[PDB]
Design an enzyme around this catalytic site. Structure first.
Site, PDB file in Angstrom:
ATOM      1  N   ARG A 114       3.914  26.557 -11.581  1.00 44.49           N
ATOM      2  CA  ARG A 114       4.310  25.091 -12.385  1.00 44.49           C
ATOM      3  C   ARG A 114       4.787  25.441 -13.934  1.00 44.49           C
ATOM      4  O   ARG A 114       4.883  24.387 -14.537  1.00 44.49           O
ATOM      5  CB  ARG A 114       2.998  24.259 -12.188  1.00 44.49           C
ATOM      6  N   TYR A 115       4.483  26.471 -14.271  1.00 42.74           N
ATOM      7  CA  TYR A 115       4.999  26.950 -15.618  1.00 42.74           C
ATOM      8  C   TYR A 115       5.822  27.967 -15.775  1.00 42.74           C
ATOM      9  O   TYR A 115       6.226  28.354 -16.730  1.00 42.74           O
ATOM     10  CB  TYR A 115       3.534  27.343 -16.393  1.00 42.74           C
TER      11      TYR A 115
END
Lengths: 116, 441, 441
Positions: free
Chosen positions: C116-117
């Site tokens: 997610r990053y």
DNA sequence: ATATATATATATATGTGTATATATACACACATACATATACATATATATGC
DNA sequence: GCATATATATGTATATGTATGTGTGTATATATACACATATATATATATAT
């Protein structure tokens, strides 16, 4: 997320002990939310309003939004820790009414608080 | 090495206020015109980008969650596939916009499915309701590849129910019936008496009755005998395990009733034998009310409308009809703008079609020909002509089989087709085309 | 209804044998050519799918994990994105397969973060070692959309460290150094006596000592004083967490050591104050043997070479030089196939270009006349000409700006340009182009 | 002198977000160690032997 | 009064046999705890009253 939710809730947690606030030992670290490539160099923007005020003045770019430290690189972290930026958190004299106005369970405080 | 004194009041008035307004518009409350969340606009925008090739191909819910940051999503994507998973059902929503593939559920399971098992595609309902989306209003952010809002022909937010909850603020709208909203916007077109639409919940064989603002959603039971009984419908806020652990489990511990499974294909079927300790009245009305209260087959509900306009601020409506007529007037204004824009393009494509037809008719028969010359002075020679002007670039890059006489007439007849479409769309109005839009259902 | 007896010999030797076959040949093994397990082949294959449009745009790992099932993947995507998170290290891997953007950990931490990053894109080193990928051997399954394997100039299995684990067999290979393997494939190309490449670790100041089929990876330490201690490097199987938990903490709660941190631009800097009840040996070799016994700075590792070949079958080896030589003799056959096939297409291209150039030289006031005559007449009369035998579809798809003098000389010079490319790729052979693609580092 | 009418803050709960974790099979063929014990040498000593 | 001798007890050092890995990720699923609010509900605590 961070500076709007875990920030004022932990300040309401810290409000039991003001002595570390007038000791100046609490230091918020201002963190960038947009790293933008312009030309060759980069520009840092801490909050969304800082970008949106300077969005129109800055030329064509390639931005990267920053959700947190998981998107931040090695050299970016070493620059913001070896040259850090701190906000010194000072409690006012009316911290109790502000924390009741912003952390009390009554929703009406949040109703006419946003209506100004 | 920066140190700045930072007071709590300006901390509140900048970032707590920013968190409050962010939870209002960008996290909880949809805009009143189309009824989408911004993350929901990301979901159907990714549905458009996935089904640009084919409508009928089924994409994964991980595939609808995959490429989302390039369109302007900047937050936790797990909420985006869970919000996508809470729309493609046939049972929580009357009006799906996405065909599903897998056990998305029934009323007997409230849990959404995983992101590892279910496919989805867009439904036909996107192609029934959401039209002319090339004329959607452009969002102020360049990174916002979905528009400011989409283009509905109906108030969509009434059709499936929305529970928005933010910083000091609440709103709830409830699902309705498709023909009721259809005749309501039919009356709202013609300026007639607009009836507030009938409330419908899907896979619900009971009924919803409005009592002074409260809505009663009624579960159904029937006396199998004097001591035997069959529950056939329950309210939707009780699931199978929720009706068990909130009613049925706190009734066998006290020795009141006895329950077993009878859940047929229709829905929530239970069979209950009343014990001798749980006594019932001889008169059926207070016995019926006692069973109706003890089994929890009443679902009370209350309404709240704090919804968002096109000007980026809040607006509170008392009822349905005012939001309906506000939707009607904004739809009439933007459909008038889109037909004026269609007039602008229908005359531009007329001008290009007549220019290419006259150009081909002079290329076949005339002095306008090319033979081992200089492309550039040929384009300047076409730039001398007033009605070959501003179209010179695709004329040199135009195929040789138009040079055959089979297509030299074909360009002319297609230009005549443009003619009839041009002065066909010069006469149309808002009301007859939107009447066509409502009779497409 | 089929009440059939499925006996246990049938159950084992069909189903469990197929499960074992899937583990040994399609889950765990990398081939000796590309160094990729099939889930890695899926990851770089969809990285090539999303590499189109720009080679410098950064992409989400979940955007790969979305439509990996289009290529023939029928398992969970979480293992695929965690595999790609490992090839996103460039500290567990000497050879950087993908350029990345986000937090990827260091020597001191090993668990990569979630997708997610994390942004990822194809690295340039891919393009240094992988080329000419349209000649890749297409897999026997039709929905296996990636091929059997790809085209590296190098065995990548020995560059980053392989632990391959399946039913029954197991294998392990250490990484190496880029100049050592580069001069190794020079010397194995030339047929001389081939030297062993040096095992390298990224970001690592320890020492690999090669004794009796045994790799002693040695962390570094220095006596700053008699009692005070500074370990600067720990061995590679340990990170900072397990060096604290299994070495520093169990000796710290025994009254012998008190450890602290002294890291910096390099990790694993531990400053340890020994306690007065722990014996410091004045015999420095006994000190060295006891610090190796207790602190465990020597990590000993034995390799294991079992591989699936180019034919799809198991092969057991003991030396890396034999893998280099097998790579060379396997690779040169497909290089010669590429040379012959490239000769075929480059010729077809030259006769196509000469045909279209001599066509245009017979159009401009030529005998091939286009006006006044239909499509079918020109297709038939050019089809009767042998030097327009099967090309007339792209002659008719050609457009009218191929009429001037400048394009006629352009078609002539491009025809002779692919003529000299035809002769240049006609003269050459395997060895000098393999030398060229080696020296394009 | 306690039965009962009644009032009011407890318990989900809805969806959105934002973040964690965890039991297992896979297998070599060693890696480190966990004690561990165990047999045997030799020392001293003391008590016998003289 | 002194040779002496051997006996066994404890260092000790190695060599046994096990025991625990976790390796290093793949693979399978699942769980967790919070902030945002009104709407009921419920259940039991107090008053009074004869």
């Amino acid at each position: 997320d961070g500076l709007g939710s875990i920030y004022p809730s932990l300040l309401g947690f810290f409000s039991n002990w003001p002595e570390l606030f007038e000791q100046g030992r609490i230091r918020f670290v201002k963190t960038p939310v947009i790293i933008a490539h312009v030309g060759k160099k980069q520009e840092w923007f801490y909050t969304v309003a800082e970008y949106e005020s300077a969005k129109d003045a800055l030329p064509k770019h390639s931005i990267r939004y920053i959700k947190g430290l998981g998107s931040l690189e090695k050299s970016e972290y070493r620059e913001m820790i070896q040259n850090p930026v701190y906000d010194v958190v000072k409690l006012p004299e009316n911290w109790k009414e502000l924390f009741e106005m912003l952390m009390g369970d009554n929703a009406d405080l949040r109703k006419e608080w946003m209506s100004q | 090495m920066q140190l700045n004194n930072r007071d709590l009041k300006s901390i509140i008035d900048n970032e707590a206020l920013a968190y409050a307004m962010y939870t209002v518009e960008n996290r909880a409350i949809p805009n009143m015109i189309d009824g989408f969340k911004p993350v929901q606009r990301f979901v159907i925008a990714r549905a458009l980008d996935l089904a640009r090739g084919n409508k009928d191909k089924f994409h994964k819910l991980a595939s609808i969650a995959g490429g989302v940051a390039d369109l302007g999503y900047h937050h936790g994507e797990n909420s985006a596939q869970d919000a996508g998973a809470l729309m493609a059902n046939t049972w929580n929503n009357n009006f799906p916009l996405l065909d599903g593939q897998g056990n998305f559920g029934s009323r007997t399971v409230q849990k959404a499915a995983a992101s590892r098992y279910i496919f989805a595609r867009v439904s036909k309902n996107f192609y029934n309701v959401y039209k002319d989306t090339e004329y959607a209003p452009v969002h102020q952010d360049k990174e916002h590849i979905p528009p400011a809002f989409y283009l509905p022909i109906i108030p969509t937010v009434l059709l499936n129910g929305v529970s928005g909850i933010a910083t000091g603020y609440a709103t709830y709208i409830l699902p309705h019936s498709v023909s009721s909203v259809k005749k309501a916007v039919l009356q709202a077109l013609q300026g007639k008496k607009v009836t507030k639409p009938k409330v419908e919940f899907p896979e619900f064989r009971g009924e919803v009755v409005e009592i002074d603002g409260q809505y009663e959603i009624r579960g159904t039971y029937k006396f199998t005998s004097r001591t035997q009984m069959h529950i056939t419908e329950i309210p939707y806020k009780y699931d199978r395990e929720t009706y068990v652990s909130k009613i049925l489990d706190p009734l066998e511990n006290k020795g009141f009733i006895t329950w077993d499974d009878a859940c047929g294909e229709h829905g929530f079927g239970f069979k209950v034998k009343f014990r001798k300790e749980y006594s019932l009245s001889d008169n059926e009305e207070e016995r019926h009310a006692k069973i109706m209260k003890d089994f929890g087959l009443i679902e009370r509900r209350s309404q709240n409308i704090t919804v968002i306009n096109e000007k980026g601020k809040l607006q509170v409506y008392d009822n349905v009809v005012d939001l309906i007529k506000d939707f009607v007037e904004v739809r009439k204004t933007y459909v008038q703008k889109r037909i004026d824009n269609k007039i602008k393009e229908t005359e531009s494509a007329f001008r290009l079609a007549f220019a290419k037809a006259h150009f081909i008719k002079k290329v076949i028969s005339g002095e306008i020909v090319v033979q081992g010359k200089t492309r550039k002075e040929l384009t300047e020679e076409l730039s001398k002509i007033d009605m070959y002007s501003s179209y010179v670039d695709k004329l040199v890059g135009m195929n040789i089989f138009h040079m055959t006489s089979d297509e030299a007439k074909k360009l002319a007849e297609e230009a005549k087709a443009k003619k009839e479409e041009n002065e066909y769309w010069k006469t149309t109005d808002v009301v007859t085309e939107y009447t066509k839009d409502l009779e497409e259902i």
